Design a protein around this ligand. Sequence first.
Ligand SMILES: CN1C(=O)[C@]2(CC(C)(C)Oc3ccc(Br)cc32)N=C1N
Ligand code: NI
Ligand code: NI
Length: 402
Amino acid sequence: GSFVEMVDNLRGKSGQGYYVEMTVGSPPQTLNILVDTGSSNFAVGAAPHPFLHRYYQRQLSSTYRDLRKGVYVPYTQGKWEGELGTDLVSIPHGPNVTVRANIAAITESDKFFINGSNWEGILGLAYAEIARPDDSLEPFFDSLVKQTHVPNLFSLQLCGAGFPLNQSEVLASVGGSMIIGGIDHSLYTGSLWYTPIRREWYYEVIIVRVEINGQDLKMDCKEYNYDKSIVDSGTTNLRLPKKVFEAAVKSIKAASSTEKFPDGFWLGEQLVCWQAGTTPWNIFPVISLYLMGEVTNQSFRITILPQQYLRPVEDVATSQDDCYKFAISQSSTGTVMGAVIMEGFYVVFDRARKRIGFAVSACHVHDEFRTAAVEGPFVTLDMEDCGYNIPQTDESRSHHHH
Ligand SMILES: CN1C(=O)[C@]2(CC(C)(C)Oc3ccc(Br)cc32)N=C1N
Ligand code: NI
Ligand code: NI
């Protein structure tokens, strides 16, 4: 249970994503690649862009092969597109192996690259079902497992930031570890609890109960997973379905009512500040998500602190103050357990056993009164089915799966 060479292999800027160094092609072209458990393509900048100072140059790679097929990927914010091919890929601070993987060479994009994020590509770690153009495009991790003896598992320790912040002009630096093929015991303390992967597409899980400062939200538990709940390293916030978001904000407002914040704050559109080191952490409640256990009628809870859901941002004009962004936000596409959740925990993506593990992170941000926690079991007699069944479209139904 030791992978010393892979510890501390993640870097990034607060709110702009965690990246790992990867090499592509022969000779190796080193690139910084976003670790994204919410998508399934390996896609790298492959042409000049304002926000890039390096990119994948296919012509410099003797081992590159063009697949003679394009790919176009639209999403809420914008799009990326490019040419599909294969090349040799390694992770210099990962396993001592080289694999031939699919690579999408991004030729054009809109609102994809983030200025100052320091990454040039994305490593989609989710399953083939959500790969583009379709599920025949084998994701990177699938290739890695198939071509090597690397166990079908990876784990993420994402370490967040906090005051005092070093720079006023630029965003705070974050770090972490991606352990490929195993679990490193130095990265967590206490018990490691597993929730089933409900289905292999996103890393979909089931939330059975939500509490805010020990108070049950008392909603039909299907509402927690409407229309899915996923674990996504490529999302910053904890994102909650509309009804759940409104109930949670109501509860957090009530707890912190001594402070009257503007509407913009609760919408994540405005910072709120206190004089340096005087932030009244104790007026903000802990949030507990109970996840379905491996055993029928069992659950366990993960509990996060306001230090996780209030993100530090050092303002240029307000450098005397500690300022924060509210990092819980509304979703119309289900619950997203983003960096806000993950930064409390060591998270094990145990693909081999179709489960996701949580333990208290050795690096989580806390104070002297409360800690992020992973606790169980909690037993519920005749536990209900909290999973939502997405209405089946004719287009989806018509697909064959040979
Ligand atoms: C929420 N989410 C996204 O919007 C997405 C989708 C896609 C990979 C297309 O493009 C990006 C680009 C940058 C960042 Br940062 C995240 C993503 N990945 C996740 N997980
Ligand atoms: Ni390096
Ligand atoms: Ni057929």
